[PDB]
Structure formats: C-alpha cells, structure tokens
C-alpha cells in the first residue's frame, strides 16, 4: 500500500480516524454506519495489498531470480493480474468517494452517505461478470496451486531459499504464499457480512436502505454463481475420474 492510504486507514475505526471535534458533531447512528463503511474500505485496501504481494514480491521475484519450468509461475498464482485489476479499480472508486466527501481544510474528516450505488455498480453488469469468471477460475485452481507450492518448496533448494528470504520480514508474517491464496478465496464471502452491517445502520435515508438492499442481493447472486461454477482441478487427474464426478 502507499503511505497516504495506510495513514488514512491506520486507526482501528472511523471514530478514531476523524478529529474528535468532528466526531462530536454526529449522531451515534451515523458513527455506527461510518465505522462499518471504514472497515469495508480498510479491508479492501489490505486485500489489494495481498494481491500486490502475490504479483510483485512473489510472482515477479520468481520470474526474475529463479529458473522454474514454463507454466509453473502461472500455476502458483492463477488469475492474479485479473484479480489485481478488478480490486484495484474497486478500491480506487471507494477511495475517490471518501476523498470527495472530505471537509475543506481536512485530509481525515468525511462522511460517506451514498455507498449503495457504488456497490450496485461493482456487483452488476460487466464488472460482476468479470468477478464471477475470475473467481470461478481462481477458486477452481486453488488446490492445484497449493500442491504445486508444496512440491517446489520440498524439492527445489533455490525456491526454498527465495521463499524464506522474501517472507523473513515481520511485515510478511501473515502473508506466505498459501496464506495469500486463502486470503483471496475468503475475500468474496466477507462482502455480505460487511454490507448487511452497513445496511443495519443505513435506515435514515430510504433511498440508501433500498440501494444497499439491492447491492446485498447482487453480492449473494455473484457468490451463488461462483460456488456453483467451482470444480477443483488436479494435476494428473484422468478424464475417467472427471466424467465419473
């Protein structure tokens, strides 16, 4: 992540991020809504950072330092460029909505009142079709990626040295290769939990309550489509094992 966004989302909550004199100007219900919207954006910033560790630290490091056989790096990191494009674009829209809402003279005091429309746009039309296609492919290649990683780490000395080197820093403690893969697979199922809690505190404006209700339904439709489109790929599985599913 870049320092400007890390600092903007360093606090444990929106109520601790904004100036106390600004916090005291709002009702409790507004503070509750803003704290959950802040958690959705903060966790999206961290999810894009997980994807940057996968693309820049791991994938590109393996291409530039190691002599892996062709197709091995794509097998370890399936769909990572497509996932990075989807989420970096969504994060950009969330951060622009926050930036437009800032009070003049402030880089931290804002209230986001219209998140629903942004979520409907993300989870409908071509962006939802791309999210569905990409997660159905990524999640179906998840087992294969973990098995390929385990095989290389156990048998290739230069690969083991590379992994131990780039994951040594304390800031990578939660972000080894397998940990990144499962963080990405689990991201999509965090959205309904966050949206339902934002919706719980968004009854003040009926148009907002209706828009978040529509977005929650679109997210659950996307998850149902992805879940029905998954079948784990396995290296060496024979056609007979597949057609006898």
């Amino acid at each position: 992540s870049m320092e400007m966004d890390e600092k903007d989302f360093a606090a444990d909550s929106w109520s601790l991020a904004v100036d106390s004199s600004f916090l005291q100007q709002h009702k409790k219900e507004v503070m509750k809504q803003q704290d959950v919207i802040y958690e959705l954006i903060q966790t999206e910033l961290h999810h894009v950072r997980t994807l940057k560790i996968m693309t820049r630290l791991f994938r590109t490091g393996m291409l530039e330092e190691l002599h892996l056989e062709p197709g091995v790096v794509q097998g370890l990191f399936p769909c990572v460029d497509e996932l990075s494009d989807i989420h970096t674009r969504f994060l950009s829209q969330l951060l622009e909505r926050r930036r437009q809402a800032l009070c003049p003279g402030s880089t931290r005091n804002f209230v986001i009142h219209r998140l629903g429309d942004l979520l409907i746009s993300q989870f409908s039309g071509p962006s939802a079709e791309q999210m569905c296609k990409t997660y159905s492919e990524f999640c179906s290649r998840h087992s294969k990626a973990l098995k390929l990683y385990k095989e290389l780490y156990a048998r290739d000395k230069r690969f083991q040295q590379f992994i131990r080197k780039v994951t040594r820093p304390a800031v990578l403690k939660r972000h080894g290769v397998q940990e990144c893969i499962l963080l990405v697979t689990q991201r999509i199922t965090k959205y309904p939990l966050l949206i339902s809690r934002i919706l719980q505190h968004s009854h003040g404006i009926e148009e907002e309550r209706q828009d978040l209700t529509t977005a929650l339904g679109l997210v659950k439709e996307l998850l149902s489509n992805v879940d029905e489109g998954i079948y784990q790929l396995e290296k060496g599985a024979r056609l007979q094992e597949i057609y006898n599913r």
Binding site: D35, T43, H46, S143, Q186, L193, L223, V226, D227
Partner: protein, 179 residues
C-alpha cells in the same frame, strides 16, 4: 518455532469471529468490534514448545459448499464452535459440521468449544429461550456432545470477559503438536 494451522467452524450465530478477534488482540474491543477477521499468526509457547499458530475463520462461507472446503487444506487443529445461548447451534454439530470436518480433515483433532458462557446465567437470555421451550446449554450437554462426536476435548469460554479464551488456544496448540 514450528508453524501450525487452526480453523474455526460452526453456525453463523456461534461467536467464532469474536473469539478470534479477542484472542488475537488479548482484548475485547472497547470502541469498535470488527465485523470480519482476515487472518493472524499468533506466537504461542505451550508446555515449553514455541509455535506460530495461523488462525482462520469460516464466517461467511456457511452457505457455499464448494467455497467453504477451500479453508480446510493442511489444517492441524479444528475448533468446532456452538453458542451456549443457542441449543440450535449445538444440534447442528453432529449432523452437519462433524461429518464435513472428518471428511476434509481426516485424523485432525477437534476441540468442541461452547462460546458465550457468560449468557448461561443471563436473565434476558433465559426469558427469550423459554418462549421456544428452550434453556441455555448445560455443561454436561456440551461434554456429552463432544464425547459422542469423537472430539479431542470439550472447553468453554466467553469472548466478552476473555475468560477461558487463552486456555482454548493453548490447548488447540498442544492438540496441533500431537502425532
């Protein structure tokens, strides 16, 4: 320090997310309780052995039968949770959660954990459950379920007060270390 992986499973109302949050911060949040838990790697020393224990939640995956099992590969210990304020969450342990975990995590120890133990003697909880001819789960009902399902053991905790939380994760670490 050897690395081990823990996964918590249970119904949506079981308190698994809160349990992971309170353990990882050693604090029940005073200002904002997070809606979700990403992951965490805890440094734990149990009986003289140092372990890096990776923690994962299955919250949000309960309705997605092809996404949920992707959380299980190479798990070393399972915490299988129910809430003491919900006999319905305990009823779903033997029929749904246990056969799934035994299938995807063969031979992995399961610790059955009764969450929200502070609600066992909460008057509002007892009044609400009485309307459905129910009462909070008794300790013997938890132990009997753990015995029936082949659990490694039975433990209780309260994320709200932190009581019993450290003990659950230290025992999970000991179970993960066993051959």
């Amino acid at each position: 320090a050897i690395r081990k992986k823990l996964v918590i499973v249970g119904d949506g109302a079981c308190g698994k997310t809160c349990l992971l949050i309170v353990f990882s911060k050693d604090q029940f949040p005073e200002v904002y309780v997070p809606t979700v838990f990403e992951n965490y790697v805890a440094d734990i020393e149990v009986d003289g052995k140092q372990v890096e224990l990776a923690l994962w939640d299955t919250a949000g995956q309960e309705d997605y039968d092809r996404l949920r099992p992707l959380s299980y590969p190479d798990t070393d210990v399972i915490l299988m949770c129910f809430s003491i304020d919900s006999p319905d969450s305990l009823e779903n342990i033997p029929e749904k959660w246990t056969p799934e975990v035994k299938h995807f995590c063969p031979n992995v120890p399961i610790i059955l954990v009764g969450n929200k133990k502070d609600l066992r003697n909460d008057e509002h909880t007892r009044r609400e459950l009485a309307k459905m001819k129910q009462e909070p789960v008794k300790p013997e009902e938890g132990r009997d379920m753990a015995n029936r399902i082949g659990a490694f053991g039975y433990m209780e905790c309260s994320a709200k007060t932190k009581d019993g939380v450290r003990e659950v994760f230290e025992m999970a670490t000991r179970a993960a270390l066993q051959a």
